Structures are given as C-alpha cells and as structure tokens.
Design a protein around this ligand. Sequence first.
Ligand SMILES: C[C@@H]1NC(=O)N[C@@H]1CCCCCC(=O)O
Ligand SMILES: C[C@@H]1NC(=O)N[C@@H]1CCCCCC(=O)O
Ligand SMILES: [Ca+2]
Ligand SMILES: [Ca+2]
Lengths: 591, 591
Amino acid sequence: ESWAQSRDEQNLLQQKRIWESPLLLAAKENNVQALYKLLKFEGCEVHQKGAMGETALHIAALYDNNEAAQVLMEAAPELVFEPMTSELYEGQTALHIAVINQNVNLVRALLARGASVSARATGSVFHYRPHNLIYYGEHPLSFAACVGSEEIVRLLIEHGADIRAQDSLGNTVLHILILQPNKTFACQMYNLLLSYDGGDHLKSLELVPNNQGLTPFKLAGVEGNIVMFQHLMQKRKHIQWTYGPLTSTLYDLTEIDSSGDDQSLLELIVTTKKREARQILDQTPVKELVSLKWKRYGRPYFCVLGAIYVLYIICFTMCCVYRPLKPRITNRTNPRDNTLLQQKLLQEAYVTPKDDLRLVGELVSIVGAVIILLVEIPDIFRQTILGGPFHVIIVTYAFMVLVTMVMRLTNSDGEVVPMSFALVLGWCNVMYFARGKMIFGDLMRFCWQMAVVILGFASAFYIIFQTEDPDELGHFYDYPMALFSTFELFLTIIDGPANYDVDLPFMYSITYAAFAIIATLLMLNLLIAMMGDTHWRVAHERDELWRAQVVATTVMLERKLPRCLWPRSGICGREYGLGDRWFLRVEDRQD
Amino acid sequence: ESWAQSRDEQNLLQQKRIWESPLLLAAKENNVQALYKLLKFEGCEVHQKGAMGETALHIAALYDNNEAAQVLMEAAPELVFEPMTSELYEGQTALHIAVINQNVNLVRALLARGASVSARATGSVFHYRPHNLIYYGEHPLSFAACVGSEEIVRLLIEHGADIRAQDSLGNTVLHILILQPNKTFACQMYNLLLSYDGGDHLKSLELVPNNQGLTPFKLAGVEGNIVMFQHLMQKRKHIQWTYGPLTSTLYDLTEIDSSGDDQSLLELIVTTKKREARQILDQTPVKELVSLKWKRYGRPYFCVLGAIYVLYIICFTMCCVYRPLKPRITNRTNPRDNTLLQQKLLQEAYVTPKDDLRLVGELVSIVGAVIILLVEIPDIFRQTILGGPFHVIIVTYAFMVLVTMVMRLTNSDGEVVPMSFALVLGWCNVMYFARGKMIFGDLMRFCWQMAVVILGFASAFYIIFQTEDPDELGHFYDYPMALFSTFELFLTIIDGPANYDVDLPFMYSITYAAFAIIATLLMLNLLIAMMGDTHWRVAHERDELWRAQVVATTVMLERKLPRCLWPRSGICGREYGLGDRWFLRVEDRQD
Ligand SMILES: C[C@@H]1NC(=O)N[C@@H]1CCCCCC(=O)O
Ligand SMILES: C[C@@H]1NC(=O)N[C@@H]1CCCCCC(=O)O
Ligand SMILES: [Ca+2]
Ligand SMILES: [Ca+2]
C-alpha cells in the first residue's frame, strides 16, 4: 500500500540522485564544460548508475541534450549498450529514450555507435497495464511506430530492425499500432511497416497472431478501432465491376465468421465487455453479414423455436392448473385457527381416467427439461449477457422441474415452493422471445412482456391459493378469475390479496413481492420507451442495443443448430476459381 | 431460397467466365495487343456469349475500355446490336452500358455504328423492385436522363430518341426523373426533356399518365418530392399583379382536386402509406386549399354532424338506462348460491305507458344504424386510417345494434353482451370528434376523451349490474352513482368493483378489463402531450399529424355530402374567360 506511491517516491528519489551526482546533474543540465572538467580531470565513475539504474547517457537521453550525450559517448562509448538495471525500466537502453523523444541526430549517432535494435525494454513501466499512460512495446522499432516518426522507423529497418518481433504479450508492431489513440494517423504508419515485410504469401506479418490468438485485423474489431478496421478492410475486398453509381464489391469474409471454433469476429464482439466493439458489427462488410443471417434462417428459427417453447411452458401449466388431490383429511384445521390449508398430496395415483392425460404431459415436462440441460450444461463448460438472461433462467427453470420430480417420489409437503418457481421462470423467459413506429414498436414489447408476466404469476397465484380456502382471500379460486385478479393486480387497481387474521402460505408473501417489482419496472421501462424515443436521437441508442441483442441471438442460434440447417453465409470460392474462402457479394449506390 | 443468392452466384460466375474466356478477359483488361493476337490469328468465336449472355463488347462496355471496344467493333460490327441474352439483363445492349457510365466517346461511336435508341432493357435487374438499388427504366434515353448527363440526352434525341417512350410500368422519362434521389438536380434535367416535346397543346408529355393513372405532376405529390413539386408548380401558376411586397398569384388547381373520381391529389395523399407524401399538403398552392375547405363548410359540418351523433348516442343510452323488466320469477336463486341474477326479459310488451317513449327511441336507434350502414357499407367496396379508426367503429356499432335487434324478437338471455358493446363503441367513437396553448390544446382533448370514455363505460357498468343484486358489489345501483363510481374508477382511487364470493356476470370481467387499459393509455397519452409539447419542436411533429388528421377528415366530409352543400373550391374560369378550370387566388407578402 501502495505501488504508485513507490514510483512517485522513486521519481523523486531519481531527481535526488541527479541533484547529488554531478556527472548525472551535468548530463541533465547539458553542462558541456562541467562534463569535460569531470571526465578528463579527474576521472569520475563514468559507469555511474543512478537511482533508476540509469547511466549518465540515459539522463543525457531523457532530457534532449545532444551536446552532453555526444561528450559521454566519445569519452566512454561503452555507455551505449548499458540498459537500465532498475526494476521499473529493466531492459531500456539509451536508444529507446532517443527514439520516443524523436531525437533523430541522437538516434543517428547511437546507430552509428552500433546500438541494439532488438533490446527488449521489459521494465514494469512499459507493461500493458491501466496504471501506465502509454504502451508502446519493448523493441525500439515499436517505439518509433507509435510516436509517428516515419523517419526513425525506416532508419531502424536500415540497421536491421525485425518487424516480425513480438513482445512479452505476443504482439507484433502491427498489434500495438491498433491499440493507439491516434487512429487516423496510425493508418499511415501501418502501411509503412507492411512494405518491409518478406513480400511472400506465407509467413505474412498481418497473419502473425497475438498470444491470445488474434491477428491484427481481428484485434481491430475486438478493440473497436473503426479507422483501422475500415483501413484493414481495403486489403480484403475486391470490386467486381462499376455500373454507374453502383459498385459491386466482394468482401473476403474469412476472419469475420466461424469456424473456428472460438475464433470468429462475431463471437468475440458479442462476448466482450468492450462497449466500443459493438460499433464494429455496423461496418459495411459486417452489417450486410448479420442482416442476411437474421432475415432468412435467423428470424424463422427463432419463432419456430419460440412457438415450441411457448407450447412447452403452456403444457407445464396445464399440468399445474390441474395438480394432484386430495382434501385435508386431517383434523388440524381446528388447532392453529390461523391456518387455511386444505393440503393435497399423492399417491394415491395412478388411478387413471383423465390422469394419464397429465402424466404424458408431466413426461413431456421432464424430457424437455433434460433436453434444455442437454443443450445448456455442456455449453457453460465452453458467459456474457448481451443478450438477455435467457440462459440463466432456462437452466434454473429445468432445475426446478427436476426438483419437483425429486419433490415427488418422496411425497414432500413443500411441493408448491419449487413448482411455483418454474411457473414464472418458464413464462418470463418467454418475453425474451420478443426479439422478433418506434413508440409503437417498443409498446408492442410491453404488451408482449406484460401478458407474459401475468400468465406466469396468475398461474403461480392460483397454485398458491388452489389449496387454501377461497372464502377468505379468494382472489384466485379458479383459473379465469386468477388471471383477471392478477391482471388488475398488475395495475394496482385491486388492493392486492391482503388478509391478516388468516395465515397465508409462505409463497404468497414471496411471489407477490416479486410481482410488485416487475410490474413497476415494466411500467418504468415503458415510460423510458415513450419519452426516450422522442426526446432525442437516443432512440438510436435505445435501438442498436436491441440490434446487438438480435445479433447476439443470431450467433446463439448458429452454435447448436446442425449443419444440415442454416447454410453457410456467402458463396464458396471453389469452382468458381477463388480458393478456398467464402465471399459476400455487396453492391452499394453513391450519391 | 433465395433469389439474391443466385445473382450473387452469377456475378461470381460471370467473373469466372471472364477469367476463363481470353476474349472476354482481354475485353475487361483492355489488352489491345491480345485482342489483335486473337481476332486476326486465329479467328476466335467473337460472338462469344459470357455467363450473363454478354458479348465481348458488353464486357468492353462495362469497364470503360474504349481502345478495347473500338477493336471489337472494327473486327465485328455486328456485336453492337446483340443484347444480353441472359434473364437478369434481357434486352440490355452495349449502348445502355455506355450511357450509364457516361462514356461520351463510346456513345458517339455506338451511335455512329447505328445503335438502337429504342432497345428496351427488360432484364430482371432493371425492374422497379426494392432489391434493385437503381431504377432508370428500359430505353437508353431514360438512362441518360437519370445519370444527369445532358450531353448524352440531347445526343440521343439527335439520333431519334422518342421522349414519349414508356417502359413496362407505363412510365415516361418524366415519371422516372421524379423517382430519383437527386431532386434538386433532376429539376434541371426535367426541363431539358420537355423542350424536345411536340410543342403542341394536345398530346403533351406532361399529360401522358402512368399505367396507374398518374401524370408526372400528380406522381410528384404521391411520392413526396418537394423539389419537383414546387418546380412543376411554376408551370401551373399565374401572377396576376405585383403591388409592392404583395404578389397575387393564381394557381391552376386542376389535378389537385376532385373530381375525379379516385383521381385527385388530396385523396392520394391521405390514403397512401407514404409518410413523406404528408409534406405535400403543406406547399404554398395546397396549404391554402385545405385551410379554406376547413374554415368554412369543413368545421361547421363536422360539428353539425357531431351534435347529431352526440344526440343519436345519448338516445341509445336513454333506451338502455331504462331497459326492459322483470324480476327473476325463477327459484334458481336458491341453487347455485354464487349467482346474483335478477334476470329481466321480454315481452311482456307492449303494455304502453311510458314505454312508447322508448319505442320511438328504439326506432331511432334502428333507422340510424342502417343509415350508418347505408353510408359506410357501400363505401368499403370502393381503407386507410389516418384519420382515426372512426369508420371501423361506426360499422361495428351499428352491427351490435342490429344484433341486439336480432337478440330481441327471440327473447334471448344474452341480451346484455351485444347491447353493452354498442355503448362503448357509440361513445368512444365520439371522442374522434375532438378534431374541432398547445399544452392547453392537448389537455382539452383529454378532458373531452375522458368524459366520453366514462359516459360509455358507466352506462355499460350500469347495465352489467342493473340486473345483478346491489347489496353486494353495488358500485352501480343507479345512473348518477354509476357515473361517479366509474369516474373514480378512471383514476384508480376506488379499488374497482371486486367480489369473489359472488359470481359476477361474464361482461364485467371483460368490460372492466378494457376500461383499465384505455384509462391508462389516455393517462399515458396525456404525459406525452405534457412533456412532448415542451421538450423539443417535436410539438410540430405532434401537430401536423393532427393537421393531416383534419385534412383527412375534410376529404371525408366532401365525398358523401351532396353538391348543393359544400360548394366547389376556388373560382371557375368560364366567363370570365379562363377555361374551364377552377383557380385559387393566393396573395403572399415577402420581407
Ligand atoms: C522519466 C523517467 N526517467 C527516465 O530516465 N526514464 C523514465 C521515463 C518515464 C517513461 C514512463 C512511461 C510509462 O508511463 O510507462
Ligand atoms: C455488373 C454487371 N455486369 C454486366 O455486364 N452488367 C451488370 C451491370 C449491373 C447493373 C446492376 C443495376 C441494378 O442493380 O439493377
Ligand atoms: Ca394507486
Ligand atoms: Ca384500495
């Protein structure tokens, strides 16, 4: 406690040793006469290491002091090779400091001496950490590329600077240029480094991946660099023809799509916590890509799978609305007069008349729950909500159905507690399917969301009071009136089921508490959709997020669906003779 | 699945055959030496049809390759006449491709050869479909007019380009210019094509109608082209005099008004789904036209017809508030104790004392319903809500009155279900009559809408519980308290009629559900009118729509009203000697 306090002390301790060491002070003050009155008479320790393990030349390189540095190099040419022996700057040479300060005469003189163009500055200051204001890499060639000094860049290549060099994070000089603030100027420097590549199709510098398996083009999309992305897109697009205003350009569509497997631009954009990366799926090679995946295949399968989940949940309630008998049997109704339980457990089953109709319905609710677990549980092993918490709810729903199964086969009294949780988890997970005029567009999402919530809480409130006596607190004595009570409940017109002389079950005081919060948030999410659609162009901000939600869902539907359905995007390039990648044909009009 | 996938494959398949065919490749690459080393030794198939049924000249015309095209024309002058034999480009000649690319030297050379200036490019790419980025027509003259190349336009007329030419959609060159994005530049090209007209008053190019019966001037209004509309308005306005800043201009007002019959700019603007066309009724010849139609004749007749409909509905409730007797008679009141019915049916009528007063009232409710059907049902045969859903409700209201008549004459128990629907349909259709300070202006619409809704639901809730016992659930035991209960109901102050030990009729659980939604939307439409009037100039957006609603209603009132009322707009031009059209006198001041 802490680390920044140390370097703040060391930077003060550095200026303290510079103040003290006259050789280091004269190197800072550029006192030429004081350096000759020190190096020639009387011979002072010229290999003097300062507070940061720096030589007198390092100090002479920090402060642009060419006259003082040239004196230190002619009286002791060995100081050029000495790196910073400190921990904060372990590996930095006098060439690194001269390159960043863009001191061309000092760089030309250090290269004339013979300075190492491959020295890795592995100091803790040079790390890619949020507490370091700059991240340029380790090699001096990487420093020149980031300061925008094209003169030093080629001057280092002339002395044998390996552009293929990677730092401790496996980043080439191309990766580091994309992580820079000046995006519009780094595009110019990016093309300068590519010219010095081997010129061969194999072992390309643009193909050398990051240590996290990211080519520079791929890293531009994950980091949300629009300027570098559009620039890198030029190298991978081909214009077929120009018919007046139309321009039928053909995009490469290789590193932008599965598979893979985890390697694909789309999966990396929807799963990253970087908001800025959202904008990448709106670029002119990518926005055409997800819009076609959602028009065909995407939207129909989401509604086909949607209607299946609607039937699978209405069947679960069909077995809940007609749950198992019987009357109380027990005389316990006389003691503890606050109780209202006409408790109903089994079995006492089969017995079959109309009970096999619900047994096959209960069997569907079980085989569907494990199928839900058979497609989700093997997926958590390989987690970002963008995207909706549909997956978090779909696994806890099948968890409650299995618990209700284990609740059964034991004749437990608390049947109702796990079974009522699956009612809201089953329906409210339906409203996620609303992904399938903006005031009217967001209003229809409320009408969907609202009708979905009441069909999950009225079914719940029915079960909560299907056992309990309806003469007192009879808001839900049958299904058509449990729906109507809950509907009125949703708008606070009814005072809500309230009774204090009677002991209502533990689940009402819990389920109604959650119904009171969701009913207000949906009524609060409605006002923001009524005003936030008209008050400003924020409706665009209220819009892409949904669009990104649709894109996140479209990538989701492509992972588990087999290959016979959902054909690959684009057109393959084997016979016709483009190999072997799949290309997207895009034509655009200009005005 | 799909069609765009095919052309994406064919464009890739085209570049595949170009890659393969050396004659087609050299035509694309503009390889002059390779074309002579192919056409002279050894004689290759020069009539080579590519993937899109294109000749080597077509490829030489796609990519501006004049040197390569001139070689193909001197070695085989027959390639000029060959059109694209494919399905996507059926009819396109090498002249079409040269005109769009604005290759004047190639167009001058193709016309020197003798190219057809009347070749219709009937290919599927050239269709007016949303999946085609451009729509220029079929004839090469129409292509030049859309690219803005006035040099090619007159160069085609010099070689006999028929400006009277129509494509498959019956569109002249004037119609296609209005459907173009560059509106401010198409005005210049529009005047160039009109100069080459026959110069005769009859058979004018501006009068040649679309296949959908639309002159170019009329099409500009339907499509919402403001720049072309104001430009076309210059040709049909006459300035009478200039008295300083005043300019008394006289507008033609011919194709802007009925009749007709369906042919009129106003009816085409209010019935189209094109939002952009709304702006046309705000132009300086049209905005003066509907404002005079609404000031006189318009506003009074809407309130005269308004007060008539107010009396016709209050009479319907006057017969409902005093509906037919009698007591229950039946002992069924002891079994099914949940029931509260003191059911009342007839007849048991006449009997007449004060019952003839309601019989003539019931007779008015019948003759008025058929009259409503006599003015609406013959109108559906000849449907856009702009405009209000007043017509959809006014026909279903008279439907419920006729059903209640058929409900009667059979002594059916369910009298109440069709009769209660006509109460809300009758009143809530009144609030449409609110069409007759912006915060205060939209607030008075709420006070109208609110008082109209409660007078339709309190009358309904009264009927719902006029039969049922008032000792339990007695919110509506008489009319003055049914109104006061419902009024309090409208603001959720009262917990709403709630009872669970008693079986309330089927209509309360339905009518009160609709009362709970409309009462919140009117309270939500109020907040948007309180904030959306001040937060931005969106109040203009909240305003024209109402203005367009008033204009849509004004056109509605002019269709069924006879000719003796509502005189024609403007002044006729027969004696005085302007013939025979009706003109509007408009004077404007400038600063
Ligand atoms: C100024 C210090 N004195 C010195 O000789 N090297 C240091 C250079 C500081 C660079 C800090 C870059 C970073 O924040 O990581
Ligand atoms: C490029 C294609 N090659 C060719 O010879 N004709 C085509 C011209 C394309 C025009 C497409 C206009 C449209 O979208 O309809
Ligand atoms: Ca309240
Ligand atoms: Ca209350």
